[PDB]
Amino acid sequence: ASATRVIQKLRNWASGQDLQAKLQLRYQEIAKRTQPPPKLPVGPSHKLSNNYYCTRDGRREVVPPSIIMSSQKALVSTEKKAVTPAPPMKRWELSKDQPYL
Amino acid sequence: GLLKKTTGLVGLAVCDTPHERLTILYTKTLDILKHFPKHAAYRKYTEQITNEKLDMVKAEPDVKKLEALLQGGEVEEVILQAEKELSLARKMLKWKPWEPLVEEPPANQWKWPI
Amino acid sequence: EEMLTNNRIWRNRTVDIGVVTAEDALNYGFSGVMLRGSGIQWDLRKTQPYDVYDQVEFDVPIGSRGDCYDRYLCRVEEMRQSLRIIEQCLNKMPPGEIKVDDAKVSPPKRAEMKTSMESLIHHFKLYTEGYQVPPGATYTAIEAPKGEFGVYLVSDGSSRPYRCKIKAPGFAHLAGLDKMSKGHMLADVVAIIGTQDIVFGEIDR
Amino acid sequence: EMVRKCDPHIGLLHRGTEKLIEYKTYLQALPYFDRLDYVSMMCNEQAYSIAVEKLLNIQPPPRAQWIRVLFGEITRILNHIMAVTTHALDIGAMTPFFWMFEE
Amino acid sequence: ASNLIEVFVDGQSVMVEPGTTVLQACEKVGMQIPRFCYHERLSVAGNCRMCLVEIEKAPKVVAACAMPVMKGWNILTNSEKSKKAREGVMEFLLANHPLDCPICDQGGECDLQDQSMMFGSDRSRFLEGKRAVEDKNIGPLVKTIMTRCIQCTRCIRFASEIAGVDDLGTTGRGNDMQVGTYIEKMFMSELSGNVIDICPVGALTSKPYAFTARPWETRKTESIDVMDAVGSNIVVSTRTGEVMRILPRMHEDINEEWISDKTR
Amino acid sequence: TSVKPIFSRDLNEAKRRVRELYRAWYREVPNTVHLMQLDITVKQGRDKVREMFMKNAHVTDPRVVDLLVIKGKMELQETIKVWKQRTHVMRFFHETETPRPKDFLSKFYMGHDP
Amino acid sequence: TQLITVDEKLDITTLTGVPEEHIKTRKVRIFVPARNNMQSGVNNTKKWKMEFDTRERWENPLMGWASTADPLSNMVLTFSAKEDAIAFAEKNGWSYDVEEKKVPKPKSKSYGANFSWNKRTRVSTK
Amino acid sequence: GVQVSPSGEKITHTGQVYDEKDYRRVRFVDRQKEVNENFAIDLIAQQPVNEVEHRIIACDGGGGALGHPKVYINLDKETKTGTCGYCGLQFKQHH
Amino acid sequence: TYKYVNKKEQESEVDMKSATDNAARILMWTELIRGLGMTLSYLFREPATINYPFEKGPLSPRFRGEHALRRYPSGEERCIACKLCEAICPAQAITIEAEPRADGSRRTTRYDIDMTKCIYCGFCQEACPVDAIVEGPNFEFSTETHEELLYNKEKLLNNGDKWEAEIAANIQADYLYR
Amino acid sequence: KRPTVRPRSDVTHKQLSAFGEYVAEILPKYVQQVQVSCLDELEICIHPDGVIPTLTFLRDHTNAQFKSLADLTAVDVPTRQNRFEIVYNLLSLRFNSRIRVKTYADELTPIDSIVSVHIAANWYEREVWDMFGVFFFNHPDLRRILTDYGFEGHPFRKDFPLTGYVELRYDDEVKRVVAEPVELAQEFRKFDLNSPWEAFPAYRQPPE
Ligand code: SF4
Ligand code: SF4
Ligand code: SF4
Ligand code: SF4
Ligand code: FES
Ligand code: NA
Ligand SMILES: [Zn+2]
């Protein structure tokens, strides 16, 4: 910040940039090191009614894997059609912001 | 349409005659598939996959429009995949995966938690 | 970029150094920039998004030559795209709570812990036993800065993992160093180690 | 100076993290992930947090996910600085390391 | 054989003797009903109501510890009504319970803590003050912190039936009902120390053991008592090379669930 | 008692591999003593090889013998390549270890361990 | 590829890297752990456990910490059946003692017995 | 507070002090045994007893969320004070 | 969406002008001169170096530093030997023993932190129900021996008595975020 | 819509279930089990003979194209007679999908190396050999990768102790680093954490 106008011109010319607008050293633009106290909000389960845990228990909704085929207990068995694991991924579009560097 | 300058992928070169090359590979794949047993699922499904792609190649003479139908990337990636399927079919003929299960596991081999 | 990008010495040390083809990169187990440097259009934040990545706009830099110079350009541009995401995160930061409102998983706030009987019990149990995880296994992957970072985590139903296998992207990349270094000098090998972007905390675990 | 074979010997930083995690609770195991790719710390945490969240069948709240992406991309910059400038330092260009490590 | 009757636990058939309770039928399918007042070696009490479970096609939940099973009943141990009954009961237990877990010896091996984790809600909506009761001195072996008591009456039934000492009872009624001796009196049976185990909460704890250990620390060594010729099976809890306490180890043909105060 | 073999169908075929590995270790000792500058004789190095082989002389299962040879070939490889350092080779000789006495009385005096 | 005939006990002790002292002098206990009498839950009495014989712990002169020379002092292995645990100990060459699982005996509970006309089961208090 | 054993070593608030014949005393030669001098047992006993109008008083230790979990203390017994199990403060009922 | 980082291969014809500009760039090292310009521009920038130890790097109230054991305003210890910190400690760096104090209080007789096991994670101070164990702000406690970093209860209580004024003020600044 | 619970779709479960049937019908010689978890992850469990045919099929078949091996690891389950579960995690960029292939092994039954299918498997198989002691047939260069030179045992086995059997120090008499039996100033403290009350009734095992 304290560079003379001559040195500012020199370093601006040498770099090819306007360095004074984006100094890497921090001055008064940053936050104060003491702040007012926060008051944080509470989540959606902070209710006094209609809030039974059994209606919002994600862990108790997990179940064992579905057995599609088992050589032991579950036989898997017009021409049945072939399938893929998922549909083919669509091609990405070229960026409109800046397609080429 | 004008021939591609690059495929966009390092090591994959542009094909000058993609329609001909795809026809060769797909036709070759259907020949080796006739050597499979009729009931083998690999035969039935691979025949469906290959015939569907062969009919697209017959249908569309434009490379760009053909790439849109095949949905397998650049036509050179489609050719590469076609060669991979043919190589697989030769191996499946010797492996014979259509045969019954070679052995059951121990009863609790796949039981989790223990 | 002013120092390196167009510098003829920098280009002489990185152009056509450690060229990897797209097909080899896939078969060698490469991910991240080691794929995109060879033109493979893949990035898990776009293909398999997690958290709020489907709500931000950014571009995936793609290489054309599969060499160290293209991978350097990809990483420089990825930093520019990160700034683009950060800007959206700053403006779109929503209000509300910062952990799941579910005291059998996330510990309750300290004021609740010191007032309510349930909160104290749940605080006590979460910091001693921990939460039980229903049995199962997942392979979870993200687009880490070095490539696909994965965990294969097995639960046996208890509060301790049964098995945790970590997939480090650099483990496959270093395994490809011998492939990438063929027909190159010792000084090139120094460049190719750098181009893989390797940390041994993750390769060795 | 032509390189005929590269044989990388590793395990010189193998510390048995994966075995140690078996003796930890899920929360106790979290800091081990900071110390894996210890240039991309928060991204390692995020991978493990998502895996646990999946097995728990719970989701983190909206503001947490925006924070996690925000810091994920800060971390990516932290990583790419280290990747680019040390790579340059190994090729002889020492100066970019210093400018960017102040960032 | 002919006396066995068919009931269902969540649709699975079980053959049980006449008089078998709903709680016991669930045991035969490996399902443990939550409980506080029930203890299999004491007389049924049915006062805590943590074992309430829905019977299919019946609109009132039944106390599983006391209700005999009827032929054809389908016990839905995980139905929404069962689950909401457990949450409601747990919420009542925790309303006046003291925020004592850090200073309470039961912490980490507490059935109130654990069944709260597994069957209760995760938060409190109780916005009042809490009850607090004074503590009774019943001797050098058992410490009483009766604000933690949940009025399950297990100690009263142990003292009367197992130990043959009719000195424990309840005084008052309503929210003010207090477990104790009314007068200043010592609880010094040769079996007295077993009330520490069967008290589900930290209301009754071991004076010699107080504050020395947490249960996740201790290594358990299963062993035998030598203070007499009975050969009671015990667990020797140790930590960092030191013996911390002696617990009973169940053996149906010797000491069942109990030990003597010398053994303890 | 029907098992898959690894390499050897019987203990006689496995013994043949053991003798080959023993020959390879025997020839390597003088080169290792010389290249690593170990402060031991060649005779002392070959006696140690012998003692390590006889630590497993009681094994009868051909599969276990197969895996002992596989591991012995690996150890030989990291010795010939000088991937092992002197500290690693000298570890076989336990030169700072006070051996545990084998009689009842000496163990009784020392402590409680059998 | 074909099968071969290996008519001997499976024994992998030479491939495990365990020092000989910690194979031959060790004694494992195969048992179902007893219920903690402080709690009524029975979920921890469902699996078979293998644990090693306890060895000497001593006071660390500096801090007073508990020191040990037993590398197996914390080893606990879980098994779905007694026969799985026995099989695992035998192939590792560990002498073992196996204790039979203890199940609580079935009991007759009658809330009505608390109010008997002429039996000693009548409770004096509720 | 801090006292000294016959060997001259300071005794801690936990009652620790080496024996005269304990070799481990060598560790303090030309160094020092660290002993905190503010014994909590002596300082808590210096606090006055709090007089209250009710038979149940709540203690959270002061400072609200900066203290300890809020607990309720019974003051019916007139022959002794109710002590807080967390912070050790004493309360007595006025009548 | 994707972008090319090095696909500028729209090959075109070359004029004399552009061929000469290319010739000047090669023969007169112009891009190498731009590099020197950049390093020259830094020469005349104020350096980012601070004058340690007279100046310090900025820190925040959340900073995790050297541990301490705190008291209530009366002087009574806050720790009531619950062992939640010991249970959660991911490094098993905490060792605790306790017994009834002479006045019947639940208090520790051992509270050790192996500072060379500890990973300075702050999990202990999250887990403590009474704000007894905290990581303070001090980070300048390097020692000349390993043994000096095996803190016992007396050391940890002296750290609390040494640093409470700053520790209290940092807790007042952050506790509403906890 | 229930803010704390993870949202779920049935589309991926149906797609993965159908592809699971497809794989099982094509490879009945090897496929022992197919399942799709409620996390929507497909696992193909195969006999160990089927490793090379199965993984070749998944790499090269046009409707599969699992060309990227994400990772390859083992799980030790001592209660199983084949205690080692071998897990392959595969990625298909074409269909943006993942699949898991599982087989098993014991201490004396090697698995086939899949380096001819994925060169990526090279170091992973070395890691499995090093950490678990499972041998791989036809591996180009199989040897330890993470452990120290001359290290004895496979530390990721459940019955290998956490701190091992040997420790290192510098000995001034011989002037080198030496290996000695492990002796700990503070023993690792074992915590018994499991609640004796059941957490997940959906996974309750039959009472037998
Ligand atoms: S009895 Fe249980 S819930 Fe009550 S204070 Fe003690 S540990 Fe906490
Ligand atoms: S003191 Fe314990 S056993 Fe007795 S009634 Fe109260 S909670 Fe039940
Ligand atoms: S900061 Fe972390 S590692 Fe250190 S003592 Fe606290 S919990 Fe343990
Ligand atoms: S410091 Fe806190 S958490 Fe640790 S034992 Fe003391 S009161 Fe409990
Ligand atoms: S256990 Fe049935 S009401 Fe108490
Ligand atoms: Na109790
Ligand atoms: Zn208080």
Instruction: Answer whether E122 sits within 8 Å of A48, measured CB to CB.
Output: no
Strand order in the sheet with J84-92: A66-70, J31-36, J42-46, J97-105, J84-92, J68-76
The residues of D whose Cβ lies within 8 A of any Cβ of I are: 24-25, 27-29, 31-32, 95, 99, 102
Three-state secondary structure of chain J: CCCCECCCCCHHHHHHHHHHHHHHHHCCCCEEEEEECCCCCEEEEECHHHHHHHHHHHHHCCCCCCCEEEEEEEEECCCCCCCEEEEEEEEECCCCEEEEEEEEECCCCCEECCCCCCCCHHHHHHHHHHHHCCCEECCCCCCCCCCCCCCCCCCCCCCCCCCCCEEEEEECCCCEEEEEECCECCCCCCCCCCCCCCCCHHHCCCCC
Chain E residues in contact with C102 by the CB 8 A cut-off are 122
B99 close to A (CB below 8 A): no
Distance from CA of C134 to the nearest CA of E (A): 13
| Experimental technique used to determine this entry | cryo-EM
- Residue E76, SS3 per DSSP: strand
Q: Would you say the CB of residue I89 lies under 6 angstroms from ligand 4?
A: no
CA distances from C117 to A84, E116, E122, E129 (A): 53, 10, 10, 12
Is the CB of residue G92 less than 8 Å from the CB of residue G17? no
I84 vs E102, E210, E212: nearest CB: E102
G126 token code pair: 């509720």
Single out the residue of I170, I74, I58 nearest to residue I122, CA to CA: I170
Mind telling me how many Å the CA of D100 is from chain J's nearest CA? 33
- Inter-chain residue contact J28 with B99, CB threshold 8 Å: yes
d(CA D3, CA C18): 13
Which helix (H) or strand (E) segment holds residue C34: the answer is helix C33-36
Tell me, using a 6 A CB cutoff, whether residue E152 lines ligand 2.
yes
Which atom belonging to ligand 5 lies closest to the Cα atom of E23? 2
Contact C50, D50 (CB under 8 A): yes
Closest-CA residue to D28 (of G90, C77, C127, E103): C127
Q: Which neighbouring-strand residues pair with J91?
A: J68, J98
CA–CA separation, F56 and F53 (whole Å): 6
Q: Say how many CB pairs under 8 Å bridge A and C.
A: 42
Interface of F with J in 47-66 (CB under 8 A): 61, 63-64
Which atom of ligand 2 lies nearest, measured to the CA of E37? Answer: 8
User: J118 at the G interface (CB within 8 A)?
Assistant: no
Tokens of A79: 């021409």
Residues ≥6 apart with Cβ < 8 Å to E60: none
Verify whether the Cβ–Cβ distance A81 to B44 is below 8 Å.
Answer: no
Q: Which residue of G6, G11, G43, G59 to mutate against J (max J Cβ within 10 Å)?
A: G43
Pairing of strands E142-144, E5-9: unpaired
User: Under an 8 A CB cutoff, do D57 and A43 touch?
Assistant: no
Domain that holds residue B114: 1-114
Residues 6+ apart with CB under 8 A from I37: A14, A15, A16
Nearest to J188 among I92, I95, I114 (CB): I92
Provide the resolution (angstroms).
Answer: 2.4
Dist. CA D14–CA D22, nearest whole Å: 16
Integer Cα distance of C197 and C194 in angstroms: 5
DSSP string, chain H: --EE-TTSPEEPTT-----TT-GGGGGGTTS--------HHHHHHTSPPEEESSSEEEE--SSGGGS---EEEE---TTSPEEPTTT--EEEE--
- Give the contacts of I125 (CB within 8 A, at least 6 positions apart): I85, I131, I133, I134, I135
Query: Measuring CA to CA, which residue among C51, C63, C35 is closest to residue C43?
Result: C35
Distance (Å, whole) CA E5 – CA E17: 6
Copy the structure tokens of residue D102.
């102040």
Neighbours of chain I (3+ CB pairs under 8 A): A, C, D, E, G, H, J
The reply to whether omega before I73 is within 30° of 0 (cis) is no
Q: Specify which residues J167 forms β-bridges with.
A: J180
Residues belonging to the binding site of E for [4Fe-4S] cluster are 97, 101, 104, 110, 149, 152, 155, 199
| Nearest CB neighbour to G77, from listed J78, J153, J188 | J78
Question: Which of I40, I123, I135, I177 is most worth mutating to test chain D (most D CB atoms within 10 A of its CB)?
Answer: I123
Task: Let me know if chains I and H touch, i.e. at least 3 Cβ pairs under 8 angstroms.
Answer: yes
Joined tokens for residue C159: 């509060």
Q: Best substitution site from I72, I130, I131, I159 to test ligand 4's pocket, by max atoms within 8 Å of Cβ? A: I130
H67 neighbourhood in chain C, CB within 8 Å? 114
Closest residue by CA, ligand 2 atom 4 = E155
The b/e string for G112-125 (b: 16+ C-beta within 10 A; e otherwise) is ebbeeeeeeeebee
Task: Look up residue I65 and give its DSSP letter.
Answer: -
Residue among E56, E209, E236 at smallest CA distance from E143 = E209
On whether any CB of chain G is under 8 Å from the CB of B101, the answer is: no
Q: Hey, is the C-beta of I90 within 8 angstroms of any chain C C-beta?
A: no
Please give the Cα distance from E242 to E264 (Å, whole number): 16
Q: Where are the domains of chain G?
A: 2-126
Reduce the secondary structure of J127-182 to three states and give it as a string.
Answer: HHHHHHCCCEECCCCCCCCCCCCCCCCCCCCCCCCCCCCEEEEEECCCCEEEEEEC
CB I123 within 8 A of CB I88: yes
**Which G-chain residues 31-90 have CB contacts (< 8 A) with chain F?**
55-56
Q: Which ligand is nearest to the CA of I76?
A: 7
I contact set with J (CB within 8 A): 87, 92, 95, 114
Residues E131, H72: C-beta atoms closer than 8 Å: yes
E27, B32, E145: which is closest to H82 by C-alpha? E145
Q: How far apart are CA E64 and CA E31, in angstroms?
A: 12
Q: Which chains sit next to F, with 3 or more Cβ pairs under 8 A?
A: G, J
Cα G14 to its chain centre, rounded Å, is: 26
Q: Which two tokens stand for residue J48?
A: 């160990």
**DSSP letter (8 states) at residue E249:** -
Identify all chain I residues contacting A42, using CB atoms and an 8 Å cutoff.
none
Give every CB contact of residue D72 below 8 A, 6+ residues apart in sequence: C51, D42, D43, D46
CB of G78 within 8 Å of any CB in chain B?
yes
Rounded to whole angstroms, the maximal C-alpha distance in chain B is: 62
Atom of ligand 5 nearest to the CA of E48: 4
J32, B105: Cβ pair inside 8 Å?
A: yes
In angstroms, rounded to a whole number, what is the distance separating the alpha carbons of residues G44 and J70? 37
Q: What DSSP line would sit under A3-54, residue for residue? A: --HHHHHHHHHHHTS-GGGS-SS--TTSPPSS---------TT--SSS--GG
Contacts of F109 (CB under 8 A, 6+ apart): none
Question: Chain I contacts of C63, Cβ < 8 Å?
Answer: 5-6
Here the contacts of J87-90 (C-beta below 8 Å, separation 24 or greater) are J87/C152, J87/C165, J88/J55, J88/J114, J89/C139, J89/C150, J89/C152, J89/C167, J90/J55, J90/J58, J90/J59, J90/J66
Burial of F7 (0-12, 13-18, 19+ CB in 10 A): middle
- The answer to whether I104 is annotated as binding is no
Domain ranges, ordered by start, for chain F: 1-114
How many whole angstroms separate alpha carbon C42 and alpha carbon J95?
12
Taking chain B, what is the end-to-end CA distance rounded to the nearest angstrom?
62
Please give, rounded to a whole number of angstroms, the shortest distance from the CA of J122 to a CA of chain G: 23
Q: How many domains does chain B have?
A: 1
Q: Would you say how long chain J is, in residues?
A: 208
Of all residues in chain C, the one with the smallest CA distance to D54 is C138
Regarding beta strands G76-79 and G95-98, do their DSSP bridges make them parallel or antiparallel, or are they unpaired? unpaired
Which residues in chain I are closer than 8 Å to E137, comparing Cβ atoms?
A: none
